[PDB]
């Protein structure tokens, strides 16, 4: 129990954790700096981290890893069914201007029979463990800008080194922290995608935000690409891509005199990244190009919460997958999922709101679900009640003893060309722990 | 020529250099932060670095590496001659209160026949290359708190990676940057010293300053000690050592319930580290202990500029070394060196001050040497290095500057009763500065 640890020992652990982060690149830009998100190497601070790894059952860890390749294949097959995406999201588009514009781009790609022969997925599936039922249940599937493959790897090593250093003071087995190689598996998948594209002069472009205090996480990927696969990367905003990008007659994307083989998005997932029309033109320009997108417009739309909800309905998974065991494994991870047009469920949410969460496609919980639904006269989800644990959280040099809940992310790499699937695997993990703000964590298997 | 590089390419190099530093621990505490020197992991900035490695002749690099083990042996033999240190520094002690107190501690160790059977040296010998004569000449020998073994290693890798990444844009051979493993060779020497001490529960104590913006350099050493040799380290100030330190009957130093096998000093080299009597008692406490000191009081005094100057005088090197080739190799590195009691030299410095530097044992150059001597410290031959072009990175900003450079060679030395266990060159440091200073590496030509 971390709250029982002597404060003298917490301070020593804290100092050693802070030193380790500083020497090993587990860093973010400081939130109180105007420069830390634009100029690398200035106003840096350790990434917010748990001081001790979070206990997590191995059985459920294994379950999460086992479904990763099934979700990866599912995302790919869902994305190929253009009409399914358009049908599922047609109510969303009248109320959400952002989704509507994404669907416009998708529509334009279907109008010209655009084919993505090489398709790359860099996913993270996020889970919570329900205390009472002991079920690992999916909270979401990220198909765009999956954060922390760089940093989560380091947190595993941080915790393993701390437990090794303090064996005399804390009783543990450091081998209970599982190996986490997400950054290099992500780098490998990006490199193989570049390799399938077949241009030895081409680069991988990172589409990034103008201000990015999590730049070091992204730079860990590009460092792995350069040092382990000799692939060049560039960083550009959507505005910069509009200004500096054009298409050649064959559809090759050229950005500042360099051919772009792969586009890896760490931006363009929210309306606020699209400051003007320039950013939307850039998005459309990239999509019609011959480049490998991660994600493509299809893959992006496939990660929508509305799609997650449609995939839970009877017979829908059987449209996309033939293997009945794989389907059963996915359904074991599904919490209850519903739209506001399922009126029996809306009435039930009004009668028993404590059991539901109302999630936009700013979450609403408990008593407030009743009020919001009554005003309306968004998706509805089974409320998950995780274990509230004790942990010690580090932020800006200061240790805090806190009541926390945790959330397990499983990274997934997927790559296919015309006939063949080249990569489809689980690719490491993320544990995020937060107060009942959030920190990076790892797992200690029990 | 770095000044001819297109500004678009400088910016790309700069960004890649800054990223690399951030991911690979080439960091210092920010100078404009009240916390960066006391709280690790906050208000950090890349270490000031050259963007491009400095050109340096291989012949002179080799000369510098070849004399490293001779200096290491010399420091050891000079330190054993207690009466030589006391005689050489007896004029210094009446005018410098700090040196006098160091000599008091030494005197007390000689009074009780204190023997250091295990002697550890972590040295850096600093050189400048004279443009006109083409001579590598020693500027000083550091026997205490030799900075940058952690960071200088990283700068070599930084430059090698940049040159590798930009082969299409800059014509170079990255293999011309020599391998630099100073941090791990320093760690190994500290680990072997701990091993000779023979206590598997004992720790290596770092004696450190209360505020230290170069903490990450030091932490690289302790990280190497923990991860590659399973030796624990602690960090303590001199005041903390006075408060938390005692001696057992057999002379074992215990600091906060932990036996201390090796004391590695990154403090206690200047008067301002001794805020009160507490710090002096701590220094005396550690010296009389059974622990391996790096440096011992003898080794500390042996690195004095006055000793450097005495070692340059006729027949003195022949007191300590028997091999005439080794002596000749050292004398080839010596610039002219003199004390203020050599009156012929003082008069000459008054007549031709431009040729001299007046160095305290705050340096004085040129015209000002005349004025200071007329008002009335060592006198040294002024060395005139090559003024080069380079690009310096500080706080995220690249500066094109006129620079001079300074080569440091690290040296590891370890002996027990009979045997010398380690005596080698142990990597390098290149510091480059405006005609402020940055870390650099070498590109051999
Ligand atoms: N079904 C659920 N039950 C309980 N808590 C949930 C559920 N879904 C999400 N949460 C909580 O809300 C947080 C946000 O998750 P999500 O809604 O998927 O992303 P966002 O914060 O971007 O809206 C989660 O970290 C989790 O703590
Ligand atoms: N003989 C010399 N000729 C020219 N410059 C010198 C000479 N000695 C020292 N310097 C310059 O002065 C700086 C500081 O002197 P140094 O002897 O290293 O003492 P400290 O490290 O205490 O400042 C050196 O980095 C070097 O650039
Ligand atoms: N811009 C941030 C992305 C932050 C973010 O919120 N990412 C979401 C997916 S949009 C995640 O769940 O990781 C980055 O690139 O690191
Ligand atoms: N206290 C700082 C600085 C020490 C320092 O400047 N040392 C001098 C010799 S005292 C050197 O030449 O490296 C550190 O430990 O890094
Ligand atoms: Mg999603
Ligand atoms: Mg010097
Ligand atoms: Mg010296």
Numbering used by the authors:
A (entry chain B): 14 to 374, 380 to 395, 405 to 463, 474 to 483
B (entry chain A): 14 to 374, 380 to 394, 405 to 463, 474 to 483
Give sentences copied directly from the paper behind this entry.
Glutathione, the tri-peptide γ-L-glutamyl-cysteinyl-glycine, is the main low molecular weight thiol antioxidant in both plant and animal cells, often present at millimolar concentrations in vivo. It is synthesised in a two-step, ATP-dependent, process: glutamate-cysteine ligase (GCL) catalyses the formation of γ-glutamylcysteine (γ-EC) from glutamate and cysteine, followed by the addition of glycine by glutathione synthetase (GS) to form glutathione. Cyst nematodes have exploited a series of gene gain events to redeploy glutathione synthetase-like enzymes during parasitism, within the syncytial feeding cell formed in the host root. The most recent expansion has been coupled with a diversification of structure and biochemical function that has given rise to enzymes that are introduced into the host cell, and likely possess novel substrate specificities.
For comparison, the only GS gene in the corresponding plant host of G. pallida (Solanum tuberosum, St-gss1), was similarly expressed and its product purified. Using this approach, the maximum rate of the host GS (St-GSS1) phosphate release was 7532 (±1358) umol/mg/min, consistent with a previous report for Arabidopsis GS of ~7500 umol/mg/min, demonstrating the suitability of the assay. St-GSS1, Clade 1 Gpa-GSS1, and Clade 2 Gpa-GSS5 all exhibited a strong preference for glycine, and a high affinity for γ-EC. Two of the three residues that coordinate the cysteine interact with the C-alpha backbone. Corresponding residues in all G. pallida GS-like effectors are not conserved in sequence but are preferentially small and uncharged, while the third residue, arginine, is 100% conserved: consistent with permitting interactions with a cysteine residue. However, the glutamate of the di-peptide is exclusively coordinated by interactions with charged side chains of residues in the binding pocket (R, E, 2xQ, N, and Y).
